[PDB]
Amino acid sequence: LVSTEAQIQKMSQDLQLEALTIQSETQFLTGINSQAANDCFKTLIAAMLS
Amino acid sequence: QRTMSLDFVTTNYMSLISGMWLLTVVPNDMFIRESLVACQLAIINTIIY
């Protein structure tokens, strides 16, 4: 999920050069986002430690 | 003797069957090993296992 703001600018100026688009190798499903993977990783660890 | 490096997508099942043809013609001591493996593993996990 996470990267800095300028790396989005650093990855947009070479995206048309190096075509790496299906490197992530996943089948999409409706209701799948990365902000819930980052959320469920935190409410599984922090609900165990407390 | 310039070492090639394959690049492909795993969702393309035809690029893996046509990837069964390079490795059986071009000798595998010529592809780079980080990309010879990930193409040999793509044929294994999808086509023949």
PDB file of C-alpha atoms in Angstrom:
ATOM      1  CA  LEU A   1       0.000   0.000   0.000  1.00  0.00           C
ATOM      2  CA  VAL A   2       2.306   2.689   1.346  1.00  0.00           C
ATOM      3  CA  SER A   3       4.828   4.855  -0.512  1.00  0.00           C
ATOM      4  CA  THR A   4       5.716   8.532  -0.478  1.00  0.00           C
ATOM      5  CA  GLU A   5       3.899  11.165  -2.530  1.00  0.00           C
ATOM      6  CA  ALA A   6       6.824  11.987  -4.826  1.00  0.00           C
ATOM      7  CA  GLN A   7       7.360   8.312  -5.718  1.00  0.00           C
ATOM      8  CA  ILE A   8       3.971   8.469  -7.461  1.00  0.00           C
ATOM      9  CA  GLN A   9       5.554  11.215  -9.560  1.00  0.00           C
ATOM     10  CA  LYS A  10       8.721   9.094  -9.763  1.00  0.00           C
ATOM     11  CA  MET A  11       6.702   6.090 -10.982  1.00  0.00           C
ATOM     12  CA  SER A  12       4.503   8.065 -13.402  1.00  0.00           C
ATOM     13  CA  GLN A  13       7.379   9.442 -15.497  1.00  0.00           C
ATOM     14  CA  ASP A  14       8.681   5.954 -16.383  1.00  0.00           C
ATOM     15  CA  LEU A  15       5.434   3.936 -16.477  1.00  0.00           C
ATOM     16  CA  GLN A  16       5.062   4.444 -20.232  1.00  0.00           C
ATOM     17  CA  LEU A  17       8.675   3.265 -20.685  1.00  0.00           C
ATOM     18  CA  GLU A  18       8.693   0.042 -18.610  1.00  0.00           C
ATOM     19  CA  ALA A  19       5.360  -1.711 -19.189  1.00  0.00           C
ATOM     20  CA  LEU A  20       4.832  -3.733 -15.988  1.00  0.00           C
ATOM     21  CA  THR A  21       1.057  -3.981 -15.582  1.00  0.00           C
ATOM     22  CA  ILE A  22       0.076  -7.562 -14.635  1.00  0.00           C
ATOM     23  CA  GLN A  23       3.104  -8.169 -12.418  1.00  0.00           C
ATOM     24  CA  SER A  24       0.818  -8.226  -9.355  1.00  0.00           C
ATOM     25  CA  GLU A  25      -0.680 -11.596 -10.555  1.00  0.00           C
ATOM     26  CA  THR A  26      -4.104 -11.558  -8.902  1.00  0.00           C
ATOM     27  CA  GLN A  27      -7.679 -12.152 -10.028  1.00  0.00           C
ATOM     28  CA  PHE A  28      -9.774  -9.118  -9.119  1.00  0.00           C
ATOM     29  CA  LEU A  29     -12.960  -9.310  -7.072  1.00  0.00           C
ATOM     30  CA  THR A  30     -15.541  -6.649  -6.324  1.00  0.00           C
ATOM     31  CA  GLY A  31     -15.015  -5.416  -2.779  1.00  0.00           C
ATOM     32  CA  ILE A  32     -11.227  -5.902  -2.754  1.00  0.00           C
ATOM     33  CA  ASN A  33      -9.065  -2.908  -1.894  1.00  0.00           C
ATOM     34  CA  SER A  34      -5.650  -2.421  -0.354  1.00  0.00           C
ATOM     35  CA  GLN A  35      -6.882  -0.048   2.360  1.00  0.00           C
ATOM     36  CA  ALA A  36      -8.637  -3.034   3.960  1.00  0.00           C
ATOM     37  CA  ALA A  37      -5.579  -5.274   3.800  1.00  0.00           C
ATOM     38  CA  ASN A  38      -3.689  -2.591   5.693  1.00  0.00           C
ATOM     39  CA  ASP A  39      -6.661  -2.312   8.040  1.00  0.00           C
ATOM     40  CA  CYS A  40      -7.098  -6.028   8.740  1.00  0.00           C
ATOM     41  CA  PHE A  41      -3.377  -6.444   9.352  1.00  0.00           C
ATOM     42  CA  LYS A  42      -3.689  -3.870  12.129  1.00  0.00           C
ATOM     43  CA  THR A  43      -6.913  -5.097  13.741  1.00  0.00           C
ATOM     44  CA  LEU A  44      -5.563  -8.648  13.915  1.00  0.00           C
ATOM     45  CA  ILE A  45      -2.290  -7.730  15.605  1.00  0.00           C
ATOM     46  CA  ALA A  46      -3.505  -4.944  17.856  1.00  0.00           C
ATOM     47  CA  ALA A  47      -6.530  -6.901  19.026  1.00  0.00           C
ATOM     48  CA  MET A  48      -4.197  -9.719  20.114  1.00  0.00           C
ATOM     49  CA  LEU A  49      -1.653  -7.563  21.957  1.00  0.00           C
ATOM     50  CA  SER A  50      -4.356  -5.814  23.985  1.00  0.00           C
TER      51      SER A  50
ATOM     52  CA  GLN B   1      26.270 -14.290 -26.267  1.00  0.00           C
ATOM     53  CA  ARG B   2      24.116 -11.487 -24.878  1.00  0.00           C
ATOM     54  CA  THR B   3      21.993 -12.989 -22.117  1.00  0.00           C
ATOM     55  CA  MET B   4      18.288 -12.465 -22.715  1.00  0.00           C
ATOM     56  CA  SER B   5      15.619 -11.973 -20.059  1.00  0.00           C
ATOM     57  CA  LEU B   6      12.005 -12.989 -20.575  1.00  0.00           C
ATOM     58  CA  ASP B   7       9.111 -10.743 -19.651  1.00  0.00           C
ATOM     59  CA  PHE B   8       5.523 -11.913 -19.760  1.00  0.00           C
ATOM     60  CA  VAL B   9       2.267 -11.983 -17.826  1.00  0.00           C
ATOM     61  CA  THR B  10       0.949 -15.016 -15.978  1.00  0.00           C
ATOM     62  CA  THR B  11      -2.682 -14.502 -17.058  1.00  0.00           C
ATOM     63  CA  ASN B  12      -1.690 -15.080 -20.714  1.00  0.00           C
ATOM     64  CA  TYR B  13      -1.895 -18.858 -21.036  1.00  0.00           C
ATOM     65  CA  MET B  14      -0.682 -18.707 -24.653  1.00  0.00           C
ATOM     66  CA  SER B  15       2.529 -16.909 -23.745  1.00  0.00           C
ATOM     67  CA  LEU B  16       3.355 -19.878 -21.494  1.00  0.00           C
ATOM     68  CA  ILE B  17       2.730 -22.540 -24.142  1.00  0.00           C
ATOM     69  CA  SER B  18       4.794 -20.479 -26.560  1.00  0.00           C
ATOM     70  CA  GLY B  19       7.191 -20.211 -23.637  1.00  0.00           C
ATOM     71  CA  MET B  20       7.513 -23.985 -23.748  1.00  0.00           C
ATOM     72  CA  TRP B  21       9.110 -23.530 -27.165  1.00  0.00           C
ATOM     73  CA  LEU B  22      11.979 -21.151 -26.310  1.00  0.00           C
ATOM     74  CA  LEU B  23      13.360 -23.254 -23.474  1.00  0.00           C
ATOM     75  CA  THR B  24      13.389 -26.333 -25.711  1.00  0.00           C
ATOM     76  CA  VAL B  25      15.246 -24.512 -28.517  1.00  0.00           C
ATOM     77  CA  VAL B  26      17.293 -21.740 -26.907  1.00  0.00           C
ATOM     78  CA  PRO B  27      19.688 -23.277 -24.343  1.00  0.00           C
ATOM     79  CA  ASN B  28      18.774 -22.339 -20.783  1.00  0.00           C
ATOM     80  CA  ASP B  29      22.346 -21.331 -19.906  1.00  0.00           C
ATOM     81  CA  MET B  30      21.583 -18.130 -21.819  1.00  0.00           C
ATOM     82  CA  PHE B  31      18.538 -16.691 -20.065  1.00  0.00           C
ATOM     83  CA  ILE B  32      19.122 -14.840 -16.823  1.00  0.00           C
ATOM     84  CA  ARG B  33      18.323 -17.006 -13.832  1.00  0.00           C
ATOM     85  CA  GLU B  34      15.897 -14.674 -12.062  1.00  0.00           C
ATOM     86  CA  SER B  35      13.717 -14.784 -15.205  1.00  0.00           C
ATOM     87  CA  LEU B  36      14.411 -18.297 -16.461  1.00  0.00           C
ATOM     88  CA  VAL B  37      13.064 -19.619 -13.159  1.00  0.00           C
ATOM     89  CA  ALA B  38       9.935 -17.458 -13.029  1.00  0.00           C
ATOM     90  CA  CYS B  39       9.020 -18.622 -16.549  1.00  0.00           C
ATOM     91  CA  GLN B  40       9.814 -22.269 -15.852  1.00  0.00           C
ATOM     92  CA  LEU B  41       7.725 -21.986 -12.687  1.00  0.00           C
ATOM     93  CA  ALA B  42       4.862 -20.438 -14.652  1.00  0.00           C
ATOM     94  CA  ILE B  43       4.643 -23.446 -16.980  1.00  0.00           C
ATOM     95  CA  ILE B  44       4.795 -25.819 -14.011  1.00  0.00           C
ATOM     96  CA  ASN B  45       2.170 -24.192 -11.794  1.00  0.00           C
ATOM     97  CA  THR B  46      -0.308 -23.587 -14.648  1.00  0.00           C
ATOM     98  CA  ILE B  47       0.147 -25.868 -17.660  1.00  0.00           C
ATOM     99  CA  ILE B  48       1.601 -29.198 -16.535  1.00  0.00           C
ATOM    100  CA  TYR B  49       0.988 -29.641 -12.816  1.00  0.00           C
TER     101      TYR B  49
END
